[PDB]
Symmetry: D2
């Protein structure tokens, strides 16, 4: 008479579209009874609110808090300046809302990611499995390429946020699997169509993801892979470390963008491994008919971040973190970044580059303080 | 009679000159038995070291630590990256050394400031008299113009770092003096010749300080005036809050300079008033035959900081500080600056302008951490 | 008696105001039968058009071409991109129109400059008297300070655009007057209230022009003074060289502004002296109750141009110009600026500072090309 | 008795190496009797001069003019500021020197391009063949990918400077060959090993050129392909249009670099087609064991240029050029770029981007004026 199993899932999507994406996203979420938290912005038209109510009458537990309601909640948490407007950083509101409402699983998605299977929510519930002995995947160079789990034309690619200095030698890395205890708390689902690559790779080969052929893997301690926020489930205990980093900080006078989830993906990952938890890559797989972007503009935004990421990732392996839970571990991580900001050296490490990590660390602790205020 | 009160004074000068300035600076120092700490840089010629040895044999207690000895000291204190080279920020090394060696008074000077009286060191010892009921000067607008204590041609001027928003209405402010308890811990001596004005004032009216006619004043709580580092005595208790702020941070892509002591002067002043201590302005007066500068280059370096100073000072009046001594109060101030960085608004507050306060706050706490590590 | 000399005057003002300034500007204009050309912008409210119609019925020959009519005119002249919107550069449209319509005198004014005498237009007609032996003023340093013709408190000031390298030694310069032939083609009227000083001078001493006490002067060949566009009459022959320089060019990454007329004033002045013509300073004097400005923002906009002006003016004294009229001489000047851009050296002459002169020269010739296309 | 055929060839290489590359470059040039003009810089060590003299005694007609000799020649041509130091732009000295000395063929190379066949110079003499009916290659989209003539792993690549907006649709372009009159004046030889790709492609797939399998092609009028300066022969008549563009101009405050020959390659190509001449791609093929570069630094330098190149190439097809030879056609091209600078629109077209084309056009005409002075 095994009963009592009931995992709650909330899907977080921020968007400025008219809401037409709900026609293909609602069926998977409606069949599973999950909640969808749509976060609009000041540049979001009134057609999105009309689409949420239309799908709410069809059985979808969808909410769409207006910017006034969002700002009131942030005001009451003493963080009115934390989350800016006209930015997809406002998905942090949905993360916080789902965390306050006690959901077990928080699935971050974008408005151009459509589930391909009916068990989309169920597959993301893997972050609630708990610790068990299971096949974990280790890599001799400390990196795993989740795009090697996909059939990609015209050539092999690496995901967005993968360090560039490790790519040429990655072909000689030794991949091994063995039975070990692991506790999956983050599940990064893969994507067909336009894979999550950086603008450099997209401008070079225009990749196309044909099929998910590699299955799913759980990464052992010491093996990393970037985690995005377009098809990623985070267990509610790990959510405090999943704050979407604020963009716009200049590197050599060039404002960075498009890497908010590259940092959050690595940050929640180094926090999970310090607490004995793991990151999973594989199913559920979505289609990514990506919104229309100017690739040269995407390149101009990503370069300031890619100029620093390899150094930051290298120094993060040197810093030991402290903390008993994800709140304390994330705060310890924020102070680790401030020490890294002054020790790292290179041509790209101008005074505004070093100060980027200092303001990021403050906003990280402003985010955890808001969660502590909610208690 | 009274005996046993042996007040120790250490003068701190950082320079890239050939040491010729020692000829006019040493007599007042060696006659008082004061120590002179000369901090050279990588761009400092070998003639300075020869001049320190020539004036040492004449009876001056002068020390001139090489950059290797400086870096060895800073590395042992776990701050090898705190103080940059090719910068007058290296005077922080002299601040640190004078504090380690237990000096009562630390006098910050530049290599073009020359004492005018034989009691130069004695007058600066006023930061050691302790609390006493004394005439304190208050101003209705909360600001005091120390250049009003001087006879200046061709017109009235304000000191460098004086907020611009308060200058037009300062003529209507009411100045009052009354007997109140005060504990002087900072004594900003005045300057004849080229007064300490900003590049705006120097380019506009080219002022010349003729004489010191206003005497000396002690500013009551709530009355502020910028404090520079070219003729300023700081009691050793207040020394932890007198860290010379690191420049080079861009504001809208323009690196700031020449305001490192404007911030230190206001920071030690806010910390002192929180602890019930006061700032004094007046004697001892020095001659300032200012080193040759490109005034348009000084303006280009000062404008980035000028654009933010009025806002920073306004928010500092609304942030009360915590702490029982200068170390705790300075750290409390550093955290207050990070809150101010996210609350302040204005066209000049770009993401790099806000990150300037965040990196500065970390550097302030890196400074206090080295001070704790010493003791 | 003498008859047949019908001098036509057109006043040119560009504005984003509501037109209330017309109440004090129209009387002197309509009493003299002068035309007022008001150039609105995209950011100009609809109240200006209603004010032009209200003052037209009172007898003022005022025209206010819509942005559509402006762009239609500029497109037909093959310069649709020459004059930007949301900028006071649009006064060039008024310059062009007044020149097409055959006016003898073009008076450039701002919407906060108000005549003080009934003979405002008559005094500006001095640019039409022709050559005659008259008292011309020469200065030993090659510069004249027109603000010395005014009673200014609290101290002596220089006009906006006056080179800084020459200010300290200008007090020692010898001013001489003697009878020489001169042909006045530019008449820069002076201003009471807020004088036309740079943001450096305004922030430093906040000057107030009390009265016009020095009379009027005509500057001999080799003696220069900046000429602004807020109360300046230009003879139609000299109008082709009075193009208002387009701002927005970065200098070390900082866009310049507020100096468009500093360049036009010096350019029309160098071209006039090459053709044997002269610049006059003095009456008619206007009141300048200056529109409200953020003075620190004015400083941020002016510094990029201030950093280059002294060098540009120095090289202009060593480049002789060719041409028989203002069109040919202005084009010769534009090519001279391109040679200067590659010869000048200095810390402020970054590749974008040099390219500023190259794009400006093309725009100057784009302007003269439209002038040739008109005629 | 067919005699009298004797084509002269000069190879131009600028380098800061110690001269060891001469051991593998001299045999091909010595066997053909060609001249090698090595252009050193101020950051070039004395070991290069010792290597040129060592190879000169072995039979190589190699010259290495010191920076004093280079600057004296430039001084006598009234272009002392045209060519900067610490830059590979100094290859323009070698272009000019070979042109003054009357060589028929000028082969631009870098110090890391080694010939693979003995007929290296002979194959480059094709630019002296003269007009004849020959197979010309046309493309329906107006672009040709010379990297498709090579066997490249791991996937197909495009050359550096190839427009990005045309790459996805290039696979559907129709390539056709037919007998037509053509006059080859530029021969772009291909490269094995590290192909001449942009940093985007190199950071994405790390290409490797295995073999030259496509043969050689001559491009018809209307079909373009970028031409670099690492293995390219230019007939002396076309050399005036082959000026290596000066880099360092900021685009949105980011200085461009590494595209000096991308512009010169397209510029000499549009000039050749207007004069009825053609560009050849294929043999002779060199090995490119490229010097060690930081690819992320290469990316940071190339992005400012790639942000504008697609627009510039599009507008160059709209502008008809004038001129009877390459000097007049290049000068007409320079004026065409100035008109393009004001008509083009886009986010990347900041004021400093538009001014880049204006200063480039001046330097282009400064280069032709120097060649006209040589006459
Ligand atoms: N509030 C708000 N304001 C905007 O001005 C605003 N403007 C767009 N958005 C929303 O942000 C989401 C992401 O946009 P895209 O999917 O179109 O762009 P991608 O390059 O595919 O996303 C990449 O970067 C993302 C984060 O940087 C990762 O999550 C992805 O994994 C990764 O592929 C969309 O839903 C969109 O509708 C706004 N939301
Ligand atoms: N280590 C090092 N490296 C350098 O590259 C380096 N370069 C110069 N220096 C030293 O810094 C001191 C100050 O220089 P100046 O007196 O010439 O400039 P001022 O405008 O007169 O000083 C103003 O600003 C100062 C702070 O910026 C305040 O202290 C003064 O109150 C205020 O008047 C001198 O001794 C000089 O020799 C270096 N020292
Ligand atoms: N088209 C348009 N668009 C705007 O966005 C736009 N915004 C303002 N304006 C108009 O430009 C005129 C000048 O503005 P201000 O008088 O307020 O500023 P000042 O500092 O006093 O003027 C100084 O600089 C001027 C040149 O920069 C010289 O002429 C003067 O000699 C000199 O004193 C006014 O009429 C105003 O209404 C616009 N016009
Ligand atoms: N005078 C001088 N001063 C320097 O400071 C200086 N520093 C280097 N050099 C010389 O310039 C040549 C090119 O350098 P690399 O071959 O190492 O770099 P690449 O990325 O392979 O070259 C790419 O860009 C070039 C032009 O931008 C094209 O020609 C090539 O086709 C294309 O592949 C070399 O010989 C080198 O030794 C200097 N020369
Ligand atoms: Mn997407
Ligand atoms: Mn000084
Ligand atoms: Mn005005
Ligand atoms: Mn190379």
């Amino acid at each position: 008479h095994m009963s009592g199993r009931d995992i709650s899932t909330a899907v977080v999507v921020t968007t400025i579209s008219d809401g037409g994406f709900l026609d293909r996203l609602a069926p998977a979420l409606r069949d599973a009874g999950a909640r969808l938290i749509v976060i609009p912005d000041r540049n979001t038209g009134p057609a999105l609110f009309a689409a949420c109510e239309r799908h709410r009458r069809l059985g979808l537990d969808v909410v769409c808090p207006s910017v006034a309601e969002q700002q009131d909640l942030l005001e009451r948490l003493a963080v009115p300046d934390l989350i800016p407007y006209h930015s997809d950083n406002r998905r942090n509101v949905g993360y916080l809302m789902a965390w306050m409402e006690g959901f077990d699983v928080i699935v971050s998605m974008d408005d151009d990611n459509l589930p391909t299977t009916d068990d989309f929510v169920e597959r993301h519930q893997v972050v609630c499995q708990g610790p068990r002995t299971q096949p974990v995947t280790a890599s001799s160079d400390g990196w795993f390429n989740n795009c090697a789990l996909l059939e990609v034309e015209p050539t092999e690619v690496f995901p967005r946020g993968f360090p560039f200095h490790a790519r040429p030698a990655h072909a000689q890395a030794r991949t091994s699997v063995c039975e070990r205890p692991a506790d999956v708390r983050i599940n990064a689902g893969l994507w067909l169509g336009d894979p999550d690559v950086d603008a450099i790779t997209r401008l070079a080969v225009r990749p196309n993801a044909l099929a998910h052929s590699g299955g799913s893997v759980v990464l052992a301690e010491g093996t990393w892979c970037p985690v995005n926020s377009q098809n990623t489930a985070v267990h509610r205990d790990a959510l405090p470390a999943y704050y979407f980093l604020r963009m716009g900080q200049p590197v050599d006078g060039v404002p960075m963008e498009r890497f908010g989830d590259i940092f959050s993906g690595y940050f929640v990952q180094v926090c999970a491994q310090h607490l004995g938890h793991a990151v999973r890559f594989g199913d559920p797989v979505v289609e990514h008919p990506r919104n229309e972007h100017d690739l040269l503009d995407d390149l101009h935004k990503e370069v300031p971040a890619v100029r620093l990421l390899d150094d930051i990732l290298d120094h993060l392996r040197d810093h030991p973190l402290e903390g008993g839970d994800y709140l304390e571990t994330y705060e310890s991580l924020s102070y680790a970044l401030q020490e890294i900001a002054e020790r790292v050296n290179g041509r790209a490490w101008s005074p505004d580059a070093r100060a980027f990590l200092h303001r990021s660390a403050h906003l990280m602790r402003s985010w955890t303080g808001a969660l502590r205020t909610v208690a």
